[PDB]
Amino acid sequence: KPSIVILGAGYGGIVAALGLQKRLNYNEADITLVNKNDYHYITTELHQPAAGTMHHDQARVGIKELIDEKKIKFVKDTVVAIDREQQKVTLQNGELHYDYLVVGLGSEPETFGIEGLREHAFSINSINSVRIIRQHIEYQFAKFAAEPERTDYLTIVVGGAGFTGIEFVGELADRMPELCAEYDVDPKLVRIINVEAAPTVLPGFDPALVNYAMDVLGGKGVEFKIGTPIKRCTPEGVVIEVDGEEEEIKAATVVWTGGVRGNSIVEKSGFETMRGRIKVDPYLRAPGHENIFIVGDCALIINEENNRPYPPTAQIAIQHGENVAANLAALIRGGSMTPFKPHIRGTVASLGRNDAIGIVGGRKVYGHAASWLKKLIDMRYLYLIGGLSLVLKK
Amino acid sequence: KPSIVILGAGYGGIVAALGLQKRLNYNEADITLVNKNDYHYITTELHQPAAGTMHHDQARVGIKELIDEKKIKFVKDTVVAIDREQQKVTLQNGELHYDYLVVGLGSEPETFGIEGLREHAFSINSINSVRIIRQHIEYQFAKFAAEPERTDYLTIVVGGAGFTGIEFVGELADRMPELCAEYDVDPKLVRIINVEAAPTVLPGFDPALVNYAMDVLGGKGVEFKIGTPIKRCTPEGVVIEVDGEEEEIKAATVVWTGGVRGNSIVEKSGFETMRGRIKVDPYLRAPGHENIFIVGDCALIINEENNRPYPPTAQIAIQHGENVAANLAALIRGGSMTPFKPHIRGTVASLGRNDAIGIVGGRKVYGHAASWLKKLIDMRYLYLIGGLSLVLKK
Ligand SMILES: Cc1cc2nc3c(=O)[nH]c(=O)nc-3n(C[C@H](O)[C@H](O)[C@H](O)COP(=O)(O)OP(=O)(O)OC[C@H]3O[C@@H](n4cnc5c(N)ncnc54)[C@H](O)[C@@H]3O)c2cc1C
Ligand SMILES: Cc1cc2nc3c(=O)[nH]c(=O)nc-3n(C[C@H](O)[C@H](O)[C@H](O)COP(=O)(O)OP(=O)(O)OC[C@H]3O[C@@H](n4cnc5c(N)ncnc54)[C@H](O)[C@@H]3O)c2cc1C
Structure with a gap:
């Protein structure tokens, strides 16, 4: 039984974890999910409790409620460092070894050395x-x-x-x-x-x-x-x-809100990075590592159409997790992996609780229409990770 | 036509103002009420919003809603000093003259020079x-x-x-x-x-x-x-x-919560004080001033039966206001004044929202009983200043 360790239960990690859960039978692999909190927060909604327009509990969910304890062992701890040579992850209160690693530690703020x-x-x-x-x-x-x-x-x-x-x-x-x-x-x-x-x-x-x-x-x-x-x-x-x-x-x-970078633990662990992000291979693996996958804000994808990087988004993080889960299952079973290709849909920016802007389906949207569309899109993610029950909760 | 000026719309000032309102005709005297806020707060309840167990709006009421504008002119301003010689009160945004003065500016914190x-x-x-x-x-x-x-x-x-x-x-x-x-x-x-x-x-x-x-x-x-x-x-x-x-x-x-003193304005204005309070005559007047009355926490009363001072309380502040209003009306109309005589009823200390301690009537009270008694006693004050309407409001 191979050991799969997932670092960070954000969009990338939760989706990857739940994907492996759905694809693999019992005892096919050990799956350990590490997160500093016992809850997964809806990062895209955090601007609301920050302004006090929505209670913060509306923007988080217990991880144990989402996963199958018989398939995934959840570990509440803080990642400190990754040792690539020993294939060991160092935590504040212990250590973990892996055969496969999924890094989804998300972003940290980038202040560009601006004083104070x-x-x-x-x-x-x-x-x-x-x-x-x-x-x-x-x-x-x-x-x-x-x-x-x-x-x-x-x-x-x-x-x-x-x-x-x-x-x-x-x-x-x-x-x-x-x-x-x-x-x-x-x-x-x-x-x-x-x-x-x-x-x-x-x-x-x-x-x-x-x-x-x-x-x-x-x-x-x-x-x-x-x-x-x-x-x-x-x-x-x-x-x-x-x-x-x-x-x-x-x-x-x-x-x-003027800039972010890939979590510094990644770069400090010796990975070659650009703004903290790893320019992964077509299978979302860190270059030089057939057993290390990078998802979410720690991963860098270049749009070959215009040589510009995709922005760190929840939307592409979700697609990362789905692909990694599929490819890990294949590797465990000795099969062939499938190359990742992002499909960028529309994103709506809220302008308070009753107004918004964005592109949906290929058309510009405004006002109440855009505002409801954003809510529906966000609801889709809740359904993805928690089914109808999580949607009904809030 | 005498000018009556009341400084501070607390327990002492509000009761005095409403008393004069009820006793005097529309042409017997000018009545001016000065307060730094347009609202009167229920000081005895302030411990609740401080702890967040009750919304602060439950502990205050608009002054304009309590008084008769045709009888009392309300002035929203901050008292700076009192000129006894000129019989003039100096405010931050103006000045006032009086024939009779009622001082109810309340207490300020006393830290006894304890560092920091x-x-x-x-x-x-x-x-x-x-x-x-x-x-x-x-x-x-x-x-x-x-x-x-x-x-x-x-x-x-x-x-x-x-x-x-x-x-x-x-x-x-x-x-x-x-x-x-x-x-x-x-x-x-x-x-x-x-x-x-x-x-x-x-x-x-x-x-x-x-x-x-x-x-x-x-x-x-x-x-x-x-x-x-x-x-x-x-x-x-x-x-x-x-x-x-x-x-x-x-x-x-x-x-x-380790000590209070009379508002420093009283002492700064040249009045002889003890811990910021004035030891008033039997008619609650400042000694050497037949036209200046002191009410509430600015007034010091000694129980002549046992020579111990009464503590600065809302209960005695209310009784101060009633006595001054009665005595002022008498002075305006050339009648005889009545010496202040305190009747100290029971006081209940809350121990959270569901527990309390105190003396009521002549018996010690505990628990839910004591708790309800305190609420009813506080309700009595609301009726006094605002009738049944204010009671129904809170
Ligand atoms: C207000 C705001 C609004 C946004 N709106 C949108 C939008 O509308 N559409 C869109 O596509 N994107 C949006 N984003 C961006 C999106 O939220 C991020 O791209 C997304 O969160 C990235 O997913 P992630 O899993 O890589 O990182 P994260 O969501 O941040 O997940 C990181 C997880 O790992 C944990 N973790 C971090 N460090 C450690 C550590 N050392 N040890 C253990 N655990 C750790 C964290 O607690 C967290 O649970 C928004 C972002 C913000 C701040
Ligand atoms: C938590 C707490 C609980 C209490 N519980 C009880 C109890 O249960 N029973 C009891 O008998 N007593 C109780 N007290 C004491 C009671 O609240 C005071 O004795 C009472 O407030 C005194 O009445 P006062 O009018 O003299 O002063 P205040 O109530 O303080 O009124 C002063 C008024 O004058 C205004 N003012 C002050 N300075 C100026 C200025 N320079 N210019 C213009 N306006 C000014 C103020 O804004 C205020 O409106 C309690 C006190 C506290 C803090």
Whole structure:
């Protein structure tokens, strides 16, 4: 019985684990799933509890409830290092050996060495982190009424006007009326500032969709500072660069959505990486390793049509897991593997709870239509991993 | 036509204002009520929103909803100083003249010059302050899951084991199960520590009631450190004295319930005070001033039967307001005044939402009985200032 070890129970890992579960009979292989939490969180929904527009329990599910304990041994622990030569994974509270390894440790924030950013800014990338953001913001607003001159309490800076940043400021905008009512705050004093180094909001997306997004969010009071890089971050705010001069934004809350990289454990373990990501072979294996598969945000795929990398998405992470599960089963059974080919469908960006933008079926979508479509797409993933029961739960 | 100016819309000021409203005609006197907020808060209930066991809106009511605009002119402003010589009150955004003055500015925290206490500990004395405490604590618990070795996040130190401290830790204890579930916290790691310099919890109360209180709160996991003074306070915690030696308690939350004094404006205005309060004459007037009345926590009353001071309570504050309103009406109309005579009824201390201790009528009360009695007593005040409508509201 060969030992398959899966590192990280995210989109890539959970799908891979459940795939192997469905494809393999009992005693065909040992399957160990490692995750630092006993729950799997819906990473694509994390902007909502971060803004307090949805309870965080709506964005996570117990791993034991998803898997078959007789087929998969779940281990709750934190991966520290991978020893490729010994084929051993080092954890905080033990060690594991493998015949096959699946790395799905996800992303970590990339702050590009910008001073104070790692230590004084917040990230939206886990249940813990979004509860921290949520309660941090509520704490600032609670402090304001006693110190009405401290409008920096009411200022939130979101660094990076990409997909995550745009969805987050949308949620923040919807949250503000209730939040201000809770803490006797003049809503006109609230500032939500989206700061982007690139010269365009949502750089790389269709201009028509972008302008609609900016118009809607702009209407809701969101400010955009574009072509404006953050130079440093403090607990008092950020310094930005405007017209070749430094300008300070006093803000008690700074959220970084300006870049991610593959989990550093991968690169530190000696794998050759580009921005922490591994340019895997056609079978999603790490080059030089016939027994190591890489999924999700740790994997790098190049679109051969335009020589551009696919972005780190949940959508492609899911497709990774399905392919790896299929190919691992084949390897266990001495069969031939099937080369991975991504099929990129449409993605919808939420603009608060009642508005959205995106491409679905090949057509531009807006408003309530787009908003419902996003919910349906997200529901499909829940059905994939937890069947109708998980869908009915929430 | 005399000008009556009332400073502070607390128990003393609101009752006095409503009393004058009920006793005087529309042309007998000008009545101005000054308050820094447009709302009157139920100070005796503030321990609940501080612990998050009751929404803060349940502990306040709009002042305009209580008074008759044709009889009383409400001014939303902050009192800065009182000029006795000119009979003028200075505000942050203007100034007022009076023929008669009623001072009901309440208490402010007394930290006795204990280092760091004023700057790093929290007080339960307004709607703003309890929302700050509430969100501070939730913020600490939110941070814990990401740093499970920082158990100091889960330690709450309450300085002073008097009436307020006991009620507050009672509320915190009831809150903990829900709070821990919200933030994935092991409840056994939580520490609620009541620190008291005196050698007994609730010093001055009946020992039987005290022992019952400690047993109930102790069962709920509340720790008591008695004969233990706080020496200094930091954002990291407190230093305490144990057997003449320094010991540190690491705690991200320190709440001070160990002493209050009369609002400093009274002393700063040149009034002769003892611990910030004025030892008023039998008609609740400031000595040397036949036209200045002091009510509530700014007033000091000595029980002439046993020469001991009455504690600063809402119960006696209410009686102050009624007496002053009656006596002011008499002065305006040239009648004779009535010496203040306190009638001290029973007071019940809550021990969470489902338990309590106190004296009612002439018998000691416990449990659900005591708990309901406290609610009814508090309800009586709501009826006094707002009739059945306000009662039905809450
Ligand atoms: C607000 C937000 C919105 C998004 N919306 C979309 C969208 O609409 N469409 C789309 O396609 N993509 C979206 N994404 C991106 C998508 O969420 C990620 O691409 C996806 O999470 C990547 O899958 P993953 O399994 O590789 O990583 P992850 O989902 O992050 O999974 C990593 C797992 O491994 C665990 N883990 C991490 N490190 C360790 C360690 N040392 N030891 C043990 N366990 C560890 C983690 O606890 C976690 O469970 C969004 C991302 C964010 C932040
Ligand atoms: C948790 C807690 C529980 C309590 N429980 C009880 C109990 O059960 N029974 C009992 O008898 N007592 C109880 N007390 C004590 C009681 O609350 C006080 O004695 C009461 O509040 C005093 O009434 P007051 O009007 O003098 O002061 P306050 O109630 O504090 O009123 C002061 C008013 O004046 C305003 N004000 C203050 N300064 C200014 C300024 N510069 N300018 C303008 N406005 C100003 C304030 O905003 C406020 O509206 C409790 C106290 C606390 C903290």
